[PDB]
Amino acid sequence: CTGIRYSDGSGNLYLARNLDWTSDFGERVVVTPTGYTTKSPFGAVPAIRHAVIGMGIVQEDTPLYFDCGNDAGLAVAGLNFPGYAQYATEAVDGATNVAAFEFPLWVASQFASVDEVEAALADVVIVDRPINDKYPSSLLHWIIGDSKRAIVVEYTSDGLHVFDDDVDVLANQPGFGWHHENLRNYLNASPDFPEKIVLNRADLVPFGSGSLMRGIPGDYYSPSRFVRAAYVHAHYPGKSTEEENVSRAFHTLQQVAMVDGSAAMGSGEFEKTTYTGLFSSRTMTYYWNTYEDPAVRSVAMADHAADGTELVVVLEH
Amino acid sequence: CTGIRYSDGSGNLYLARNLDWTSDFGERVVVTPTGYTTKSPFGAVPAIRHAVIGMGIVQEDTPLYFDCGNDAGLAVAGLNFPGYAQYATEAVDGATNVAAFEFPLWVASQFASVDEVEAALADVVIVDRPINDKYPSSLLHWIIGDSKRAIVVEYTSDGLHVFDDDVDVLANQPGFGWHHENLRNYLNASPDFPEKIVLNRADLVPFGSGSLMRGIPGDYYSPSRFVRAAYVHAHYPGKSTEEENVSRAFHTLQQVAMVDGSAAMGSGEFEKTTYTGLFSSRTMTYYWNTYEDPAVRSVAMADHAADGTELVVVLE
Ligand SMILES: [Mg+2]
Ligand SMILES: [Mg+2]
Ligand SMILES: [Mg+2]
Ligand SMILES: [Mg+2]
């Protein structure tokens, strides 16, 4: 998984991610309306304050989101983090106890800005409370963004960590602090087309574009995708239309996507980008494509009963 | 530009490329039927022996292809090669003089296999004869493929060279022999997942997939794209359906595509993958998408008169 957050300079939020996995994820577009009766194990989600749309599944009449945004311009994506994610085993009195499966629902249904979430995170404990026996708690970390900025949330063996994500990207393991320091290993990567370079007495000119981009890794390893996404995302010029900003998400994430054959897991199956999803607050719309079809599909929250009482598993797009 | 050639193990050819440029290229899907009256400046294309379909433009009622395939399972793509391409300044008496703009037309309209074009290339001189004053000869090199194999044609200051493209990919500068030798700098790149590596006394386990793919470069530089394409293309599992082989082309080329902001040209403008096109001999169809829209569009040759008499510029 790799995720990005950006804006259009006019207060609109774009948050997008690749879902990387070895097989079909079973993902569906799920709308959570304001009238839905919540099922929050520790009361962290007592009611839906903001309607939510995103990719996930429904179990026990509960939306299990992989990524989602709400009707107030805040979005969140949960990216794989096994070996580093380690949730609390029990709720803590007086804390905001959030089941791991409901954390993105908590972010999106409760708050309207990163400022609000970050303040609420001061007392948050994320608890290993599986939705049921079929689905243990996914081991994840999260990127949360509004039109202004992004934060990263990592709950590990020594507790809750919240980071200022000043590169607006996230990948997988290891922790965000490690990736951020790792950026300092690529200080000579640049899109610039250099003036002619004389090495000793050799006149060296570029073959073409990208001569100073050398060093940006192209492998599928999580630290490499973080660096490659951080570079591409930082240098992508800002856009002011919905169409160009949708195109920016899918192009940026194709730069860090995974295709068949190039990197196996321990099972021998190849990890692939199974879907790429984007939430746009400007149009209150979730866009996506899949490994099998690059055409962009979309579901608008305005097309569904966002003030209804039941979770909507969207079939039409 | 980056191009690839592959098959499905059933005799069907797939040849696809990214076109990388700083602005809109104006490209259209052009069908050249067998009844079209040619305009070959030195007679290298006296008639259309095989109908042709691909991406290009039309000038002076002449199809100027960027890439194309024919009704016999042979395809060709011209990729940018400035600084290394150098054509003959004039036609050579007694040779097969092919104008640079018509070389892909010559390949696709005349021959039915790589064997045939390779035999014919022994007498070929490629000439800097522009189509008109508005379009100088594009400086290019070509990948040519059928279901069996690919060759690379480079016409430089040393004349015509034909290479066995045993990695089935092509990028831009420098020459193919340089890139092929450069592949030997990445011998430890592998998709394999190692369970654990002991370094001194440290137990090292991968963070996840791709730990042995480290070293594959991710930058937009032409040699880097050659290496990156060679790796991805070599390791993509062979597929037997049209749908999966179409998907293979666009996923493989998205791995070496260029997006806005990441690599500037001398002008300061950013080089981007303006379109990605694929020729499929199985369905005699040209597929493509664009920087502005990733949805795959397609034109089937069967929907047009492959034995008509006029160039067809496809719209809608
Ligand atoms: Mg799927
Ligand atoms: Mg509290
Ligand atoms: Mg275009
Ligand atoms: Mg992995």
Numbering used by the authors:
A (entry chain A): 2 to 318
B (entry chain B): 2 to 317
Sentences from the paper on this structure:
The BSHs belong to the N-terminal nucleophile hydrolase (Ntn-hydrolase) superfamily, which is characterized by an αββα core structure that is subject to autoactivation. Here, we identify and describe the BSH from a common member of the Plains bison microbiome, Arthrobacter citreus (BSHAc).
To assess conserved and divergent structure-function relationships between BSHAc and other BSHs, we crystallized the enzyme and obtained a three-dimensional structure using X-ray diffraction data. It showed the typical αββα-sandwich architecture and autoactivated N-terminal catalytic Cys (Cys2) nucleophile of the BSHs. The asymmetric unit of the BSHAc crystals contained a dimer. The protomers of this dimer are arranged in such a manner that part of the substrate binding site – the amino acid-binding region – is shaped by both protomers. The latter participates in the formation of a dimer-dependent substrate-binding site with the loop swapped between the two protomers. At a higher level, this dimer-swapped (DS) loop also contributes to the tetrameric biological assembly of BSHAc. In BSHAc, the interface between the loop-swapped dimers covers an area of ∼2100 Å2 whereas the total area of interaction between protomers in the tetramer is ∼7200 Å2.
